[PDB]
Amino acid sequence: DRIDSVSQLQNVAETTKVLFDVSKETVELESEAFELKQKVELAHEAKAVLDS
Amino acid sequence: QDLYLRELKDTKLAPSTLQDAEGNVKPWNPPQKPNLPELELQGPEALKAYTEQNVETAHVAKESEEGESEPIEEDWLVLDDAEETKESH
Secondary structure, three states: OOHHHHHEEEEEOOOOOHHHHHHHHHOOOHHOOOOOOHHHHHHHHHHHHHHO | HHHHHHHHHHHHHHHHHHHOOOOOOOOEEEOOOOOOOOOHHHHHHHHHHOOOOOHHHHHHHOOOOOOOOOOOOOHHHHHHHHHHHHHHO
């Protein structure tokens, strides 16, 4: 049973840090979508002025 | 046709007075040129965001939030917390 308690950790060290990075850097990539939302909202505002 | 030609005349030269000539209209007291062309031209922005819609107020996108690059204090507490959570794994 001690071996079994060690059994789960076998194929987990493979990607624990890989997940730590995948869920970190890709989430860090959200500033681009933020700034693009900013420009899209500016486009919506000006386009609405034009539509008015 | 005279009824067609006369109608065209009375509906064109008078249409000239209304639109094609800047004579406004004698039958109607307020000219639309002093009413629509500039003030009601703000009616478009009256329905829109006034001095703000055509302007498109400057709103630069800001930065997202992070840990202030703080591993002196957050890292050790995070490690202890994660190990405490591991106590019921």
